[PDB]
Design a binder for these strands. Structure first.
Ligand SMILES: [K+]
Ligand SMILES: [K+]
Ligand SMILES: [K+]
Ligand SMILES: [K+]
Ligand SMILES: [K+]
Ligand SMILES: [K+]
Ligand SMILES: [K+]
Ligand SMILES: [Mg+2]
Ligand SMILES: [Mg+2]
Ligand SMILES: [Mg+2]
Ligand SMILES: [Mg+2]
Ligand SMILES: [Mg+2]
Ligand SMILES: [Mg+2]
Ligand SMILES: [Mg+2]
Ligand SMILES: [Mg+2]
Ligand SMILES: [Mg+2]
Ligand SMILES: [Mg+2]
Ligand SMILES: [Mg+2]
Ligand SMILES: [Mg+2]
Ligand SMILES: [Mg+2]
Ligand SMILES: [Mg+2]
Ligand code: NA
Ligand code: NA
Ligand code: NA
Ligand code: NA
Lengths: 145, 197, 128, 68, 229, 144, 49, 96
RNA sequence: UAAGCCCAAUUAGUGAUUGCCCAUUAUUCCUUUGGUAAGGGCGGAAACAAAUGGAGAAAGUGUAGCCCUUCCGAUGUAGAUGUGGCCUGGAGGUUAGGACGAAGCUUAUGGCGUGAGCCUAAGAUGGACCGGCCUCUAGUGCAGAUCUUGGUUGGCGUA
RNA sequence: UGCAAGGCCGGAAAGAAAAGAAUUAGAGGCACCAAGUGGGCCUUCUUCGGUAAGCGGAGCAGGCGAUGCGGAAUGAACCGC
RNA sequence: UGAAAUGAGCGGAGUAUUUGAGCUGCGCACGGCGGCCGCACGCACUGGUUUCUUCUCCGUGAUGCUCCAUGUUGGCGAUGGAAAUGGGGUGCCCCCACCCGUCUUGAAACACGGACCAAGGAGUCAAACAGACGCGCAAGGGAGGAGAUAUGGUUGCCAGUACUUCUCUCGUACUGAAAGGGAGAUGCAAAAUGCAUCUGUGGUGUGCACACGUCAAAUCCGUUUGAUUUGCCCAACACC
């Protein structure tokens, strides 16, 4: 009954997700593929949405809101995980199955997720190699249950 | 330097946005800005211009006035053709001086509850501007209508009341006071009721 | 991460617009105040006086707000702030707020290193 | 404290800033009040007849359109 | 694959491209023919005038030259200290800036306007080379209230929407010969904004006859304007 | 709100929109309506004619309850009738009864066309209203 | 002063330029000058006679 | 004065036709500082290292009828301490 | 044998018709800003992981202005108006930071903005509070009033 | 059947020819609500009173006020802009 | 630095092409002189001639919405108490450049206030009215005072919020000093309260949109953008 146009008119200038820092308007929205505060990228607001997220290992998850269960927040978003080695064009096609106006940014985001996974592995390896040579008087271990 | 004396006198104040805080008015302005720029119809352009206007410039219209003008148009209209949709960018208010009105389709920004009841009971329909943009995207077979402004009590006060030919109401809280000198021929001159222009 | 290349940054003016005769009085700050005096030489725009700001000094919109590194500064206060700069990392660089402690700055720098997000005021030893 | 009496300096420039506005056209404000009374009274009767004839003509036009 | 509306757009765009190319070729051919005719006309007129002068001279008679129909007027003074009548005349002549130039008809109503603002303007009788140089190098049209430099004949054709004005040679012919569309052609143009005369001026404050600049220089305005254009 | 007033825009102007020559002085034209017959006469005469003088009789101890006499017209009589009663009302049959003094009115005036016939109980009435309502199939019953 | 713009505005400029070159040819110039002087002198003499 | 352009008087250049020959030629003002800073071929030619410095420019146009020339220096104006001092006008870029 | 006065040139009876130097002016180029501004695009176009072309694309008064293209204007006392313009103390929301250092304070301490200002850095400063954004509110901005109060000061190691 | 007036129904319309035979950086009207002004001073010409005055009083129009910039060494207002 | 090279300039072809100058034909203009003579060679035949003078002819949409990203040759920089490039500091040259705030026609003024710094320091609040703009409702709008009960409860939150009104007020009618009166249209008629009917702008001129057309221009052929006739004319405005 209350459309995305009306909701955007309501929430465009005030929103917990709008981060106007300095003079830049970014977005804390978890379902934003961009960080840009635009109606197309406000995924928490649109009836249908899709966002590219990382997963354990090199896997890439696509979180999709189809608009079928928008009134039930526990069922609004469904995650589908593509295993490591997935083509960013395949991820963009999975996104465009819902939002054809998000395919380019979804391809770019999938490529960025793969790059981040590889760079994180490399940085962690280098950090471990450096830390192997230090005394480290204090180590904290969380108890198991 | 270029001699441009009196070049700011040519410029006029044109407003391309609304002072209104209504999100639904903003939605209507968005839709009809799109329609006015992407369609060749002048109806969309006029509606878009009137949506921007202020409340005082969107005067209310009455159901009796709508009925009278639509009857004047319905005569001299072929019986095969349907009656136009009466479109007003403003408010429609009921008239208790007209009890019998025909079945008309009316589009407006707001209907009073009595006006909506009267239009529906006469057999008509109360449309919104999104419905009008849906059924008549270019505004074909529409009667664009406007409300009356000349009878407003603010308008009746404009101008000096003490100059010849002026019948404006003075700003006075007491009606008995301010009636003696300048209003009566006996009490040292009376303001002339007529002046040739 | 390398920033996105742009046209050469041209500043119309590098000198700051300072208040008239602020050097003669320790009271007066150097911040600009418009001279409204009737016989003010700066207001009358004499030849040998200091200039007043106006629209003509505005900088090119293509290269406006860009720091010498080529990035635009976005203030950040925690690790979760680094995730809106993930996709536009060649446009924006994070600036850790001044009052963020060293304990939190360690985590912020560690996360930004893996994310390949530029920090304008991280530790200089990392990222060379 | 002797001051200056009167001058017309700058008055024409002020009048021509928002320039001398042209007169109202002769088809507007053509009121006949104050004119010769007998002709006015005769014209009133003529206009009465003209208004009645206009009403009759509109009625005939409506009837013809209904007929066609 | 491509969506149906995109395919429709593609087909219509291909048809538009081929039609635009055909129109460009047709306008080029029309401009060539018109320019050829105008050049032959100018040459024949010059030769006829020469022969008439020779015939008049060989028998002791005189040939009276036709009074010039077009004048070229440039503003050689600034915008300070101008009386209201001169200001109004210059505004109606569209000389609102120094070194602004216009083409006017040299009839009685305009000659009496020029005589009243003589101290501010230098005018004369333009030549074909002067008119062509002003149109080709300093030619700007008023398209949607904007000063648009003349870069091809399609802009001229679209702006004037006249059969007799489709090319820069059409505009030059109308201006030079004071045709039936002189007012249309000149009013559809922005006033020419010229550079100061290289080599300087003689005297801004005296008439050309007096040793200055502000009078009517006859055909010497071409020498004056060559250094300005 | 103070943040919207002109005092905030004039911080640094040193005159606040009153000029160097004329200045903002305390009372430069008198206090209140002083000088309405001299040095404010043009204003008083062109904007408030009739202000000065006397007119009419004096009504000592005017009680406005005795003079109470609101009016209603014939075309407005449907405001005092319920919708369903006006649905069944017709000339020559049973008609709704309107009590004007209970509805807040004393006189029936009779301008325009009466939309629904009825029986109007009124303290006062106009001759045109009485004639029109009798023509339309209604009636007026005097009340007190 | 630009070939592209001048040829766009005047397709006949390539022929006017060729005419100018032919006129500026020295042999053509001298032959034309002597011929023109001969014709004009002959016509003037025939007119007076 | 406008410090962006400098006036240079060359020996035996006393006509505008003479000054037109030098248009486009390279121009050098040689001075010295107080400390030995970096130069061209600081590593290739260590013999070049000196307190000697040079500011380069080009001849743009003649000035007057008496053989003066206007000179524009690279990026920055020539110092006012160079006024009345020696300038080198080289014969390149050659056009002959 | 003017560097004076009256007249006349522009490299001088050689062969044509611009000697040269100085503007906040003209012409043109670049950038800004504002239009009674003028237009385009805005139904993601197809494709396209990493290791090893890129990004963005907002139906929009005003922003880091939705993007692109085009044109024209831009000085100003008194005065008017505008500003997703700056700044201050509290209030309602929201979102953060702090004893791994809060406010305050210091600065050849840089960066950003035409500016009001904002931000970072450092303190060999401090020692517990406090930032951003949306709205609300007011005892909300100082250079000068023979301004008020406090401190200091040259005269002066003088009379 | 004439006049005068208010209409109605036609007709024609270089929509204004040719004779030097206009031009326009020409959106016309129409409100509303307000502020500063209300000591002015300089010229070119015209002008009055005064022996005159960097004196007093007018007309037309420009300019200072309110405004810099280039030039008359210097100068509110002169020249250029 | 070719990330769409639009070129007389690139890339393909071709050896031509037309356009000037010669020199000429016929008729016509034109010029002597009164139908003849002339004609510098105008105009038409886009006349002929080709004697010399020129090159001419084709070609690439954007399936790129926007922005950024592509040479050469040295010098310097191979991770340093370094090479650059910007910013900052201090001196110095050559140019500019009267002291601020005021009042004033006119201030750098021999006009008045001006040793320094810190803190403080000046369009406020209320009432009446008007106009602009926002919002609610509309021939109606709205209270106020006060009661009720969530709350007859709670340190507090809660002096709030929720609810109610046969009233009151401002409108929907106005005039006259009062006594007093008290506004529809049309038709038919002309009654010192005339009748009849009621789906209706009292009339006229000028006037959005919309409806039939009609022209002109441009079109990717779908149209769109201008004008315009007629109808109804909204809001207005002018005469009745
Ligand atoms: K002053
Ligand atoms: K009358
Ligand atoms: K712009
Ligand atoms: K906006
Ligand atoms: K202070
Ligand atoms: K001046
Ligand atoms: K009420
Ligand atoms: Mg009324
Ligand atoms: Mg700190
Ligand atoms: Mg003069
Ligand atoms: Mg004021
Ligand atoms: Mg005053
Ligand atoms: Mg795609
Ligand atoms: Mg934008
Ligand atoms: Mg300004
Ligand atoms: Mg001011
Ligand atoms: Mg306080
Ligand atoms: Mg005064
Ligand atoms: Mg004084
Ligand atoms: Mg003095
Ligand atoms: Mg009333
Ligand atoms: Na700066
Ligand atoms: Na001050
Ligand atoms: Na002392
Ligand atoms: Na320095």
């Amino acid at each position: 009954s209350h459309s995305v146009d009306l909701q955007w008119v309501l929430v465009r200038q005030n929103s917990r997700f709008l981060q106007k820092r300095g003079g830049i308007r970014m977005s804390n929205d978890p379902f934003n593929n961009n960080g840009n505060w635009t109606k197309r990228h406000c995924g928490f607001l649109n009836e249908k949405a899709a966002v590219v997220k990382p997963a354990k290992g090199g896997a890439i998850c696509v979180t999709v809101k189809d608009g079928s269960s928008n009134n039930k927040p526990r069922q609004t978003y469904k995650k589908t995980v593509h295993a490591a080695g997935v083509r960013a064009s395949d991820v963009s096609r999975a996104v465009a199955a819902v939002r054809p106006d998000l395919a380019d940014v979804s391809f770019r985001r999938a490529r960025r997720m793969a790059c981040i996974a590889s760079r994180t592995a490399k940085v962690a390896a280098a950090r471990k190699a450096r830390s192997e040579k230090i005394k480290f008087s204090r180590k904290s271990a969380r108890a198991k249950r | 330097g270029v001699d441009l004396t009196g070049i700011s006198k040519k410029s006029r104040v044109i407003r391309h946005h609304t002072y209104s805080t209504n999100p639904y008015i903003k939605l209507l302005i968005k839709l009809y800005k799109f329609l006015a720029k992407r369609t060749s119809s002048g109806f969309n352009k006029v509606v878009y211009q009137r949506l921007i206007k202020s409340r005082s410039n969107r005067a209310p219209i009455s159901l009796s006035r709508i009925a009278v003008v639509m009857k004047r148009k319905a005569v001299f209209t072929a019986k095969s053709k349907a009656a136009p949709i009466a479109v007003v960018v403003g408010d429609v208010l009921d008239d208790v001086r007209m009890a019998r009105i025909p079945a008309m389709r009316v589009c407006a920004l707001r209907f009073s509850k009595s006006a909506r009841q009267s239009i529906v009971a006469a057999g008509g329909e109360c449309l919104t501007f999104d419905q009008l943009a849906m059924i008549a995207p270019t505004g074909k077979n529409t009667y664009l209508l406007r409300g009356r402004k000349s009878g407003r009590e603010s308008v009746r006060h404009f101008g000096a009341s003490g100059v010849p030919g002026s019948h404006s109401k003075p700003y006075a809280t007491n009606r008995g006071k301010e009636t003696k000198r300048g209003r009566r021929t006996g009490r040292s001159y009376k303001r002339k009721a007529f002046r040739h222009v | 991460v390398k920033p996105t290349v742009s046209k050469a940054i041209v500043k119309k003016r590098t000198k700051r617009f300072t208040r008239h005769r602020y050097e003669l009085f320790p009271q007066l700050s150097s911040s600009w105040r418009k001279p409204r005096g009737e016989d003010s030489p700066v207001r009358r725009r004499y030849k040998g006086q200091k200039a007043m700001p106006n629209k003509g000094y505005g900088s090119d919109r293509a290269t406006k707000y860009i720091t010498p590194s080529g990035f635009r500064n976005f203030p950040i206060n925690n690790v979760e702030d680094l995730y809106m700069l993930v996709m536009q990392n060649r446009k924006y660089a994070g600036v850790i707020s001044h009052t963020v402690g060293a304990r939190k700055r360690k985590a912020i720098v560690r996360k930004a290193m893996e994310l390949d997000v530029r920090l304008a005021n991280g530790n200089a030893k990392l990222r060379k | 404290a002797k001051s200056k009496n009167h001058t017309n300096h700058n008055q024409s420039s002020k009048n021509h800033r928002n320039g001398i506005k042209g007169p109202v056209p002769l088809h507007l404000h053509n009121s006949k009040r104050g004119s010769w009374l007998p002709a006015l009274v005769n014209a009133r009767r003529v206009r009465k007849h003209n208004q009645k004839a206009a009403l009759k003509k509109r009625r005939e036009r409506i009837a013809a359109f209904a007929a066609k | 694959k491509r969506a149906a509306f995109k395919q429709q757009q593609t087909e219509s765009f291909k048809k538009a491209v081929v039609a635009r190319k055909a129109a460009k070729a047709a306008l080029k051919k029309t401009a060539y023919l018109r320019a050829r005719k105008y050049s032959r006309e100018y040459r024949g007129a010059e030769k006829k005038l020469v022969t008439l002068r020779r015939q008049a001279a060989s028998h002791g008679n005189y040939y009276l030259e036709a009074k010039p129909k077009v004048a070229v007027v440039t503003r050689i003074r600034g915008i300070a200290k101008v009386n209201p009548k001169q200001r109004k005349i210059l505004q109606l002549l569209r000389l609102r800036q120094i070194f602004n130039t216009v083409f006017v008809k040299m009839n009685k109503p305009m000659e009496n306007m020029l005589r009243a603002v003589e101290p501010y303007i230098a005018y004369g009788y333009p030549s074909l080379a002067t008119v062509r140089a002003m149109v080709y190098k300093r030619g700007y049209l008023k398209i949607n209230g904007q000063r648009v430099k003349i870069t091809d004949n399609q802009m001229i054709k679209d702006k004037y929407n006249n059969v007799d004005i489709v090319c820069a040679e059409d505009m030059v012919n109308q201006i030079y010969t004071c045709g039936k569309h002189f007012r249309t052609v000149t009013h559809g143009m922005w006033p020419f904004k010229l550079a100061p005369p290289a080599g300087g001026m003689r005297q801004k404050r005296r008439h050309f006859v007096e040793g200055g600049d502000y009078g009517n220089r006859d055909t010497l305005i071409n020498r004056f304007l060559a250094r300005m254009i | 709100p103070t943040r919207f007033k002109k005092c905030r825009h004039q911080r640094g102007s040193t005159f606040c929109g009153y000029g160097r020559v004329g200045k903002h002085r305390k009372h430069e034209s008198g206090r209140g309506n002083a000088g309405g017959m001299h040095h404010h006469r043009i204003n008083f005469d062109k904007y408030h004619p009739g202000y000065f003088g006397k007119l009419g009789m004096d009504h000592y101890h005017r009680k406005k309850n005795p003079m109470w006499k609101p009016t209603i017209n014939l075309n407005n009589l449907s405001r005092l009738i319920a919708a369903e009663e006006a649905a069944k009302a017709a000339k020559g049959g049973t008609l709704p009864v309107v009590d004007l003094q209970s509805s807040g009115y004393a006189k029936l005036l009779g301008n325009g066309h009466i939309q629904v016939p009825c029986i109007v109980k009124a303290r006062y009435v106009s001759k045109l209203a009485d004639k029109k309502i009798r023509k339309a199939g209604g009636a007026v019953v005097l009340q007190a | 002063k630009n070939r592209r713009l001048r040829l766009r505005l005047n397709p006949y400029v390539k022929r006017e330029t060729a005419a100018a070159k032919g006129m500026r040819n020295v042999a053509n110039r001298d032959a034309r000058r002597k011929a023109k002087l001969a014709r004009v002198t002959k016509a003037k003499k025939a007119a007076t006679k | 004065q406008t410090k962006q352009t400098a006036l240079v008087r060359v020996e035996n250049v006393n006509t505008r036709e003479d000054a037109t020959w030098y248009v486009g030629k390279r121009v050098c003002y040689v001075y010295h500082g107080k400390k030995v800073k970096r130069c061209v071929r600081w590593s290739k030619a260590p013999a070049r290292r000196s307190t000697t410095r040079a500011l380069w420019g080009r001849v743009t146009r003649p000035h007057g009828n008496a053989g003066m020339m206007r000179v524009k220096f690279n990026g920055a104006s020539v110092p006012a301490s160079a006024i009345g001092r020696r300038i080198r006008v080289y014969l390149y870029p050659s056009q002959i």
